[PDB]
Design a protein around this nucleic acid. Structure first.
Ligand code: SF4
Length: 699
DNA sequence: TTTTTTTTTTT
């Protein structure tokens, strides 16, 4: 499988980059990862490879070089998939052009979902049309006019950039802030688009990007897109012709779980309204634009016999679920083991059938309208597209609610009664607990050999959690490799566990935050660190902590206040200037921050990020683990805590020459037996246990 | 055994 010419090509590109790009430094883990990826992707050894490549190993070049070599030899496409658009851009703008220097021949593109692309037609409307005081009837028309004059100028700037190729049309590739509402208007749904009819169709960024996919050697994708391309066999080449690298691979089950997740409203009056609107809309479609294809369900007698039966089912379900909950109150009911009582299951099966039928009708009408008075047709397309979305959520919901198991585990099922607009609304919720069958069918079986890599794949020094969640198995021929970290952590930093007076239990939170803040403040006062990061496991705790350090607002860059890349922008600017700067964030910061040396010398971790015990999904899972005679804490809480802790601690040492401390304020790392195990899955650091000032609680 | 709420993206 590894031909002579291929080894020669990989070696050549390797020597090329190491002695022609300044600072490219070889490493033995890098050589091993190149060889392992090369053997897996050529078919020489087993099926799939899950290789953990800690920061510093040089992971992306390590799979890019053999991946590209094998793709060229075989006239295949290398698909590199990562977690989100920012990481995609990192691969597309930094690593691939670097390889283009030594492979001038290289053909690579990036791929994104339709929703990230501007629609030239709409933007032209927004840039070239007058804001006229929200002309009232015109607002009611929502007829493509800039809300106001500021909006109009911004749109014209965006259009100027688009037309001269300063802007590629992707939402994330422009500096100009775009409101979410604005973006909804600037982009369009597949049906809403004019395709070959539009006078821009040859000029549309999205279609051009897909055209680039077709002749490219490397496509940079995100996991959601790849999954969607495996369900709809529609955007990527045929799986058999694919080399697939799933960078940031630990995210893969969660992404797969989107296919087993739905929440939707089911409250009976609202439902009556929706069905009435739909019936009326189908009749007006038939009158206004007779479709080419008229299904028997569109026949009015049949359509509203169908809708009346659906409604009667919904109303029965409302009554049943309402008996679980106090009247006139917001409430909640979870079904243990995700198991529905027989009558409720029966109802959900019939609902699944009826809502799926309505979804099919709406889809057929929608495609008929899109195939085809442009103004009136577009109003009708929009309404029917809304209807389609409603019934999509419905059929998916009832399909999941009807499942006995998914990948050998229950689907979490539960209802909520929530207040919204002066009223109580009934929601149903389904969340698949395991997703391995999904990954197996869409990826593992479909693509001959896949690389799953990440800086962090293991939990508790083990691939066990990854194996169980992903379905990858040695028995199927998948291999699992953990490369060593290059850095020397014990000499490069320390872990600090202050002598806190309370554990961060539920009752203790107020005192705990107080003690933390005191200690944290003293650290800031030492002026020993310029780059600081504070990491929380809940937004509740983060806000509470923020109340104690309100005198430090100037110094604090808080997740959400600005887009993360801007917050890191400012952080770099101030630290380079000699000022103290503190980032404060949740999971997004714990996962995404990569700050070397001065930029981040002290990491503050409020607590061990254990999963929420009262969450319905966690409860249902623990029930199921119990029924299999496994201990939930051992199998569910502690491994998640280990993975999260590895990731959080992983912010400190990003390079040789990184230095500093990780302050962990959860005393249970020393106080509980499991503490040792969490510490043993971290890199080795010396542990210091300083005394803590008295915690003054605030009103 | 022992634990308590985060986050992107797509058809
Ligand atoms: S093609 Fe669809 S998206 Fe591109 S411009 Fe015409 S309408 Fe807007």
């Amino acid at each position: 499988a590894l031909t002579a010419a291929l080894k020669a090509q990989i070696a050549a590109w390797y020597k090329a980059l190491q002695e022609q790009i300044p600072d490219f430094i070889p490493r033995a883990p890098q050589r091993q990862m190149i060889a392992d990826v090369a053997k897996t992707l050529a078919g020489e050894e087993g099926r799939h490879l899950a290789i953990e490549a800690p920061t510093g190993v040089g992971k992306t070049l390590s799979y890019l070089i053999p991946g590209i070599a094998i793709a060229r030899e075989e006239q295949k496409t290398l698909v590199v998939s990562t977690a989100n658009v920012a990481l995609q851009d990192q691969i597309y703008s930094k690593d691939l052009p670097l390889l283009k220097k030594i492979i001038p021949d290289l053909k690579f593109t990036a791929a994104f979902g339709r929703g990230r692309y501007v629609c030239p037609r709409n933007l032209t409307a927004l840039a070239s049309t007058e804001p006229t005081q929200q002309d009232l009837l015109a607002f009611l028309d929502d007829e493509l006019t800039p809300n106001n004059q500021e909006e109009q100028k911004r749109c014209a700037k965006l259009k100027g950039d688009l037309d001269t190729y300063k802007w590629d049309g992707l939402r994330d590739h422009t500096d100009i802030a775009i409101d979410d509402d604005l973006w909804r208007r600037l982009s369009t749904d597949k049906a809403s688009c004019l395709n070959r009819n539009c006078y821009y169709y040859r000029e549309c960024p999205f279609f051009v990007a897909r055209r680039e996919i077709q002749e490219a050697e490397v496509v940079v994708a995100n996991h959601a897109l790849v999954m969607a391309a495996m369900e709809s066999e529609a955007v990527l080449p045929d799986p058999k012709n694919l080399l697939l690298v799933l960078d940031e691979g630990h995210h893969l089950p969660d992404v797969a779980r989107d296919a087993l997740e739905m929440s939707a409203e089911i409250t009976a009056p609202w439902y009556r309204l929706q069905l009435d609107l739909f019936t009326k809309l189908v009749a007006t479609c038939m009158e206004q634009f007779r479709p080419k294809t008229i299904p028997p369900l569109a026949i009015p007698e049949r359509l509203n016999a169908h809708c009346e039966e659906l409604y009667e089912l919904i109303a029965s379900l409302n009554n049943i679920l309402n008996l679980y909950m106090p009247a006139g109150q917001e409430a909640e009911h979870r079904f243990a083991m995700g198991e529905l009582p027989d009558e409720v299951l029966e109802i959900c099966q019939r609902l699944a059938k009826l809502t799926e039928m309505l979804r099919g009708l709406a889809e057929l009408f929608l495609n008929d309208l899109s195939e085809k008075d442009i103004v009136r047709l577009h109003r009708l397309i929009l309404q029917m597209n809304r209807a389609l979305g409603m019934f999509e959520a419905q059929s998916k919901l009832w399909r999941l609610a009807s499942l006995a198991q998914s990948s050998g585990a229950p689907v979490t099922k539960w209802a909520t009664r929530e207040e919204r607009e002066g009223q109580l609304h009934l929601w149903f919720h389904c969340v698949g607990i395991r997703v391995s069958d999904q990954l197996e069918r869409l990826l593992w079986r479909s693509i001959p050999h896949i690389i799953v890599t990440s800086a962090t794949l293991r939990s508790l020094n083990s691939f066990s959690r990854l194996q169980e969640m992903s379905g990858l198995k040695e028995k199927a021929g998948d291999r699992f490799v953990a490369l060593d970290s290059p850095f020397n952590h014990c000499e490069q930093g320390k872990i600090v566990i202050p002598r806190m007076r309370v554990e961060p239990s539920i009752d203790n939170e107020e005192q705990h935050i107080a003690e933390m803040a005191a200690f944290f403040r003293e650290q800031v006062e030492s002026k020993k660190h310029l780059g600081m990061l504070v990491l929380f496991a809940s937004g509740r705790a983060m806000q509470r902590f923020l109340d104690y350090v309100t005198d430090l607002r100037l110094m604090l860059l808080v997740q959400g206040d600005q887009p993360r890349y801007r917050l890191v922008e400012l952080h770099r600017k101030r630290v380079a200037n000699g000022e103290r700067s503190v980032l404060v964030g949740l999971q997004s910061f714990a996962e995404g921050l990569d700050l070397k040396g001065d930029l981040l010398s002290q990491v503050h971790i409020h607590k061990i990020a254990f999963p929420p015990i009262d969450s319905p999904v966690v409860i249902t899972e623990g029930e199921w683990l119990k029924s299999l005679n496994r201990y939930p804490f051992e199998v569910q809480s502690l491994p998640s805590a280990s993975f999260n802790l590895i990731q959080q601690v992983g912010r400190l040492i990003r390079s040789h020459g990184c230095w500093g401390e990780v302050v962990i304020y959860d005393k249970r790392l020393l106080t509980k037996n499991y503490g040792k195990r969490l510490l043993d899955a971290l890199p080795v650091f010396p542990i210091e246990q300083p005394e803590v000032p008295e915690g003054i609680v605030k009103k």
